[PDB]
Structure formats: C-alpha cells, structure tokens
C-alpha cells in the first residue's frame, strides 16, 4: 500500500481491511491512506487484514 | 436477504442495494465499484451460500452494478431490513432519507445537493451524484438510500464517519433501474 496520491477528498466504501500501527482496523486503503496523511505521516501499515 | 445486508465477492464486502426484477428474473443492485472485476457473490464470509453472478457493472462515471440471482431458495425480500419498498423516486434537496449498510446499520439525514461530481482519484470520477449529510463507512457501499417506502439511491462513497458525522454521495437508483430495465417490488 502506497499513500502518495493522498489525501483524497472522498473514498468509496467497500470493505477490505488493513491493520494500522495504532491497532485500528482501517476499512479500506483509501480510508487508511487518508488517516496516514491526517497523522502527518506517523501512522504506518502493520499488516493486511483486520487487526 | 434484503437491502442493507452484507454481500461478499472474491475481493471484499459490500452491501446489497435493492432486490429488483425483470419478468421472472431476479437480481440485486449494488455499487458499480463493488461489481467491477467481481464475478460471483456470496451471502456469507465463509463463501458457502451463493447469491449469484454479476450481470452488469458501471463505474466510474456512474456507480451501479447488477447481480443475477442463481440461488434458487434464498428469500429475496423487496425490503430494506424490515422496511417495505414499493417504488422508486428522484431525490430532491431537503428530502429526509435513510441509509442502511452492512457495517453501520441504519442512519438518517437529508439530501443536501444534487448532480454532484465526486473524484475518487486515479481517473475514477463519478457524476450526477446525490449529496447528503448521512454518514457511512467501509462495507456500507451499495446499500440503499430510501425515504419511507421509496427507493432513492445506492451508497457510493464520501468522507467522515458515523461517530463524528460525515458526507455521503449516492447514485440515483432511477438511473440503474432504467439502464437494466428492472423494477423494485
């Protein structure tokens, strides 16, 4: 997963979870990448799938 | 199974929009971004209960897809959860609407604008969208937006979340019904 094209003003809402370094499951890549941006690059990917 | 229930493809999970039909052929509508590249649909995570196969997909530009039921026994309720749906209608600004999705359940709000353009990036732009102040989250895609017994749209995407509030865009269901020559029941 690469969050360079982010942030994006909108995300589709399909569910394909990712597990962030904050132990939160992010519903999809768009959701995850926007949070990475919002965290000013501090959030990272822990693993694919639910946390 | 009815509008708002979970549906699983080989890729992930979305929500069933509305059960529709043409003659004696049953299908269900959902988001085009969910039907894109998906073939078979199942009713459960275990992929043991088959629903049917994708018959059409339109995304980006629009955001709707249709799946033909191949499961002959599963009940196909013309409702959204327990809510009966008896017709389809056009959204209007100020209209009170309700959405149901497989992740967040049922949430209400109002239509705030029409004919909105949503850019999901990478060339994925959808046009003619209904904008609302209703929240939605991953897994809710394709779920129904209704108003009383009237079918209004299919969940496409947006921003925010249900805890802090959000903005969700929906594809007008009338457009999908017309493209496929199907009707709600």
**Residue B46 maps to which CATH number?**
2.40.10.10
* Residues contacting residue B59 through CB under 8 Å, at least 6 positions apart: B31, B32, B33, B35, B36, B65, B124, B126
Residues B177, B163: one domain? no
Residues B161, B82: one domain? yes
Alpha-carbon distance of B118 to B2, in angstroms, equals: 27
Confirm or reject contact between A20 and chain B (CB < 8 A).
no
Alpha-carbon distance of A40 to B100, in angstroms, equals: 33
The residue whose two tokens read 């009940």 is B75
Residues B67, B109: one domain? no
Confirm or reject contact between B61 and chain A (CB < 8 A).
no
CA closest to B157 among chain A residues: A12
Segments making up each domain of chain A, as ranges? 1-51
Residues B25, B48: one domain? yes
Residues B100, B140: one domain? yes
Q: Running DSSP on this structure, what letter comes out for residue B33? A: H
Resolution of this entry in Å?
2.0
Confirm or reject contact between A41 and chain B (CB < 8 A).
no
Residues in a beta bridge with B157: A12, B169
Alpha-carbon distance of B32 to B59, in angstroms, equals: 5
Number of domains in chain B: 2
Are A12 and B122 an interchain contact pair (Cβ–Cβ within 8 Å)? no
SS (H, E, C) B36-93: CCCCEEECCCCCCCEEEEEEEEECCECCEEEEEECCCCCCCCCEECCEECCEECCCCC
Chain A closest CA to B169's CA: distance in Å?
Answer: 9
Q: State the method.
A: X-ray
Residues B72, B96: one domain? no
Selecting from A8, A10, A27 the residue whose C-beta is nearest the C-beta of B137 gives: A27
Confirm or reject contact between B85 and chain A (CB < 8 A).
no
Residues B185, B133: one domain? no
Residues B59, B99: one domain? no
Residues B72, B82: one domain? no
On whether the CB atoms of residues B17 and B30 are closer than 8 A, the answer is: yes
Residues B85, B165: one domain? yes
Residues in a beta bridge with B101: B105
Residues B125, B178: one domain? no
Catalytic positions of B are 33, 63, 141
Domain that holds residue B121: 78-172
Selecting from A10, A16, A27 the residue whose C-beta is nearest the C-beta of B158 gives: A10
Query: Which architecture, in CATH terms, is A1-51?
Result: 2-Layer Sandwich (3.30)
- Angle (CA) A11-A14-A33 rounded to 5° is 45
Q: How many helices (H) and strands (E) does chain B have?
A: 2, 17
CA closest to A16 among chain B residues: B12
Alpha-carbon distance of A1 to B144, in angstroms, equals: 30
């Amino acid at each position: 997963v690469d969050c360079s094209e982010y942030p994006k003003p909108a995300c589709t809402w399909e569910y394909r979870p990712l597990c962030g370094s904050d132990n939160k499951t992010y519903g999809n890549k768009c959701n995850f990448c926007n949070a990475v941006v919002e965290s000013n690059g501090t959030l990272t990917l822990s693993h694919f799938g639910k946390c | 199974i009815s509008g708002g229930d979970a549906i699983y493809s080989s890729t992930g999970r979305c929500s069933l929009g509305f059960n529709v039909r043409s003659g004696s052929t049953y299908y269900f509508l959902t988001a085009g971004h969910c039907t894109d590249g998906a073939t078979t649909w199942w009713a459960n995570s275990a992929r043991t209960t088959v629903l049917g196969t994708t018959s059409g997909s339109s995304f980006p530009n629009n955001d709707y897809g249709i799946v033909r039921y191949t499961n002959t026994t599963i009940p196909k309720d013309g409702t959204v959860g327990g809510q009966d749906i008896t017709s389809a209608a056009n959204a209007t600004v100020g209209m009170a609407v309700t959405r149901r999705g497989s992740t967040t359940g049922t949430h209400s709000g109002s239509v705030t604008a029409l004919n909105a353009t949503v850019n999901y990036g990478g060339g994925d732009v959808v046009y003619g969208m209904i904008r609302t102040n209703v929240c939605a989250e991953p897994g809710d895609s394709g779920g129904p937006l209704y108003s009383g017994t009237r079918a209004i749209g299919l969940t496409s995407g947006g921003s925010g979340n249900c805890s802090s509030g959000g903005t969700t865009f929906f594809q007008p269901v009338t457009e999908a019904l017309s493209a496929y020559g199907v009707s709600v029941y």
